[PDB]
Design an enzyme around this catalytic site. Structure first.
Site, PDB file in Angstrom:
ATOM      1  N   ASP A 164       0.773  -1.422  -0.201  1.00  0.00           N
ATOM      2  CA  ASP A 164      -0.014   0.135   0.119  1.00  0.00           C
ATOM      3  C   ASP A 164       0.891   1.190   0.199  1.00  0.00           C
ATOM      4  O   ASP A 164       0.546   2.299   0.516  1.00  0.00           O
ATOM      5  CB  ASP A 164      -0.939  -0.089   1.268  1.00  0.00           C
ATOM      6  CG  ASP A 164      -1.997   0.882   0.987  1.00  0.00           C
ATOM      7  OD1 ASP A 164      -3.005   0.920   1.932  1.00  0.00           O
ATOM      8  OD2 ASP A 164      -2.266   1.519   0.155  1.00  0.00           O
ATOM      9  N   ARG A 221       0.043   9.134   0.209  1.00  0.00           N
ATOM     10  CA  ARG A 221      -1.067   9.492   1.355  1.00  0.00           C
ATOM     11  C   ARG A 221      -0.659   8.613   2.426  1.00  0.00           C
ATOM     12  O   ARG A 221      -0.834   8.789   3.817  1.00  0.00           O
ATOM     13  CB  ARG A 221      -2.218   9.505   0.849  1.00  0.00           C
ATOM     14  CG  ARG A 221      -2.921   8.118   0.951  1.00  0.00           C
ATOM     15  CD  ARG A 221      -3.934   7.522  -0.137  1.00  0.00           C
ATOM     16  NE  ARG A 221      -3.940   6.166  -0.514  1.00  0.00           N
ATOM     17  CZ  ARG A 221      -3.494   5.690  -1.652  1.00  0.00           C
ATOM     18  NH1 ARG A 221      -3.278   6.277  -2.563  1.00  0.00           N
ATOM     19  NH2 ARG A 221      -3.565   4.219  -1.877  1.00  0.00           N
ATOM     20  N   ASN A 222       0.269   7.541   2.509  1.00  0.00           N
ATOM     21  CA  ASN A 222       0.730   6.773   3.427  1.00  0.00           C
ATOM     22  C   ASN A 222       2.124   7.070   3.850  1.00  0.00           C
ATOM     23  O   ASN A 222       2.712   6.005   4.481  1.00  0.00           O
ATOM     24  CB  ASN A 222       0.554   5.222   2.911  1.00  0.00           C
ATOM     25  CG  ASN A 222      -0.738   4.955   2.642  1.00  0.00           C
ATOM     26  OD1 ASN A 222      -1.035   4.018   1.723  1.00  0.00           O
ATOM     27  ND2 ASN A 222      -1.642   5.803   3.161  1.00  0.00           N
ATOM     28  N   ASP A 235       1.426   2.883   7.604  1.00  0.00           N
ATOM     29  CA  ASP A 235       0.252   2.161   7.275  1.00  0.00           C
ATOM     30  C   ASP A 235       0.824   0.502   7.076  1.00  0.00           C
ATOM     31  O   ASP A 235       0.922   0.377   5.546  1.00  0.00           O
ATOM     32  CB  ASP A 235      -0.648   2.556   6.400  1.00  0.00           C
ATOM     33  CG  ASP A 235      -1.386   3.988   6.677  1.00  0.00           C
ATOM     34  OD1 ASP A 235      -1.322   4.416   8.032  1.00  0.00           O
ATOM     35  OD2 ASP A 235      -1.768   5.076   5.735  1.00  0.00           O
TER      36      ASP A 235
HETATM   37  C1  LIG Z   1       0.239  16.331  11.792  1.00  0.00           C
HETATM   38  C2  LIG Z   1      -0.634  15.040  11.174  1.00  0.00           C
HETATM   39  C3  LIG Z   1      -1.254  15.007  10.146  1.00  0.00           C
HETATM   40  C4  LIG Z   1      -1.399  13.926   9.893  1.00  0.00           C
HETATM   41  C5  LIG Z   1      -2.452  13.394   8.807  1.00  0.00           C
HETATM   42  C6  LIG Z   1      -0.609  12.935  10.807  1.00  0.00           C
HETATM   43  C7  LIG Z   1      -0.649  11.717  10.897  1.00  0.00           C
HETATM   44  C8  LIG Z   1       0.098  10.752  11.354  1.00  0.00           C
HETATM   45  C9  LIG Z   1       1.228  11.101  12.414  1.00  0.00           C
HETATM   46  O1  LIG Z   1       1.580  12.273  12.913  1.00  0.00           O
HETATM   47  N1  LIG Z   1       1.933   9.871  12.756  1.00  0.00           N
HETATM   48  C10 LIG Z   1       1.152   8.929  12.118  1.00  0.00           C
HETATM   49  C11 LIG Z   1       1.534   7.619  12.422  1.00  0.00           C
HETATM   50  C12 LIG Z   1       0.830   6.592  11.748  1.00  0.00           C
HETATM   51  C13 LIG Z   1      -0.360   6.949  10.959  1.00  0.00           C
HETATM   52  C14 LIG Z   1      -0.612   8.419  10.507  1.00  0.00           C
HETATM   53  C15 LIG Z   1       0.236   9.255  11.282  1.00  0.00           C
HETATM   54  N2  LIG Z   1       0.255  13.927  11.607  1.00  0.00           N
END
Ligand SMILES: Cc1cc(C)c(/C=C2\C(=O)Nc3ccccc32)[nH]1
Ligand SMILES: Cc1cc(C)c(/C=C2\C(=O)Nc3ccccc32)[nH]1
Lengths: 287, 280
Positions: free
Chosen positions: B143, B147-148, B161
């Protein structure tokens, strides 16, 4: 694989259901395994002028699973015809994304409609459930397990009419009377029958189970089942024989009927005709 | 079934973290929330973290994906793979506590943009390097897409992810009978047609990701519907060279998209090709 075959088969195909893209005009998003937009359609199946419709389509970044569910939905909706089942008018597939043109339901989802209210009588709520029960009986006789029955998947059309919707997950059970899914399913766990959770078995009797959860959703005016209980706890809570307590504003007869929908052994649950007769008996005490 | 067995096993270490020391905040994306954790693994005081949880109305499939992520993240450790700190399962909903990435997703971050092609190549290189590590561990990601990927402090790439990740130690491939949940526009041709996933299908996806990087978060195969891809791919069509792309970069994307998996470069060779671009 199965999907490549279905895509090629489909693209090489019924002028019964094809609708010219140029006579279709899309508007706002109504909701988001697909997307639904409000739309308007010109000269739609012998209706002169414009008719307001909803249009189901693939989201951004559709997986093969999602494409398959759109194709399957299309295929079920062609075969199906009931005053309490959403109506399909056509499809656009020829020079742009696949679009299914369907009945607009002015009140949106039953869940949303319940949540917006207080004015509704027990009689209104019983009529809703009864309408849904009749649609389920007709799908059952058509040998289809719906699998995904939930307030969020029932539309409310003009006149407060129930429409069963979202046929992506429906399966044909003519031959075996059950649908067995090897990998993990995509129905929320709080709506799945015990044999669906544990054995991946789906039948008309697991639809009945779901209907039981849906009654609960109706009676609570759109509550969240097993509130504050994490989905992973459901396995153990179900096999050890726990069920949701009687909610407020729920009559004894109604609750009794939810429990029977939730009997551990599928064969012991009411079939949809018994559910309808039971709902009539309650309607008789109110009208 | 497989899930109930797993749920019981899971319920019945050094990854448990007390729920009452974790304070949830705003939603970052759909589910993941910003959160703060008191006395997290020897860090004194409060640490800003992200928390992955089950959405409202989770299906078995999503429950399994969460358990799977957790199980993979326990095993994995690389500067460019998002780091797991712990989990809460004792009471309340299952929560995984993970590294916070201050710039969010790579797609969001690219789309908000001043960046050199040097910055862009370095991003790909950091991910390639993380993929290389994951390939060595015999893991197929499946995946991989902008976006991941997350952008942490110092503009560091973090692969994220792992819900759909699969172990390929034994057979070197992951074969899914039913239809997958990876968007069609990121899947290798063999994954689309024969449901076969390998490190070489990840390489195909990495190719698509390069495209995303170079276009600052463009949408692949723009104005082409997912269902047309089957036919477009088997008849040999591929995305044209985007504007502002070197010849060498594009050449790398096409090689990622070769019809035959064995003709595609391996992660080790991509990190080299990118470092060469870095240096030239
Ligand atoms: C400031 C921010 C916006 C977003 C969509 C994120 C997302 C994440 C983040 O910080 N640690 C993560 C670990 C696993 C999956 C997503 C995130 N962080
Ligand atoms: C006014 C409104 C709100 C919502 C969520 C809808 C939704 C729908 C609608 O009108 N026809 C449909 C057919 C299939 C699935 C959803 C809808 N309509």
């Amino acid at each position: 694989g199965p999907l490549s075959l279905s895509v090629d088969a489909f693209k090489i195909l019924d002028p019964k259901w094809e609708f010219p893209r140029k006579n279709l005009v899309l508007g706002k998003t109504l909701g988001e395994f697909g997307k639904v937009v409000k739309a308007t359609a010109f000269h739609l199946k012998g209706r002169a002028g414009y008719t307001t419709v909803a249009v189901k389509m693939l989201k951004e970044n559709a997986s093969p699973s999602e494409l398959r569910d759109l194709l399957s939905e299309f295929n079920v909706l062609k075969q199906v015809n009931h005053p309490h089942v959403i109506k399909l008018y056509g499809a656009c597939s020829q020079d742009g994304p696949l679009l299914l043109i369907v009945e607009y339901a002015k009140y949106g989802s039953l869940r949303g409609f319940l949540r917006e209210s207080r004015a509704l009588t027990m009689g209104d709520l019983i009529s809703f459930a009864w309408q849904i029960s009749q649609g389920m009986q007709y799908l059952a006789e058509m040998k289809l397990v719906h699998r995904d029955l939930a307030a969020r998947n029932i539309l409310v059309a003009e006149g407060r009419k129930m429409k069963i919707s979202d046929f992506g997950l429906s399966r044909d059970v003519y031959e075996e009377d059950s649908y067995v899914k090897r990998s993990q399913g995509r129905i929320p766990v709080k709506w799945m029958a015990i044999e669906s959770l544990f054995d991946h078995i789906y039948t008309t009797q697991s639809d009945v189970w779901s209907f039981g959860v849906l009654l609960w959703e109706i009676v609570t005016l759109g509550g969240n089942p097993y509130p504050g209980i994490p989905p992973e706890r459901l396995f153990n809570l179900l096999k050890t024989g726990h069920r949701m307590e009687r909610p407020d504003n729920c009559s004894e007869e109604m609750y009794r009927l939810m429990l029977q929908c939730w009997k551990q052994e599928p064969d012991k649950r009411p079939v949809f005709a018994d559910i309808s007769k039971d709902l009539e008996k309650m309607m008789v005490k109110r009208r």
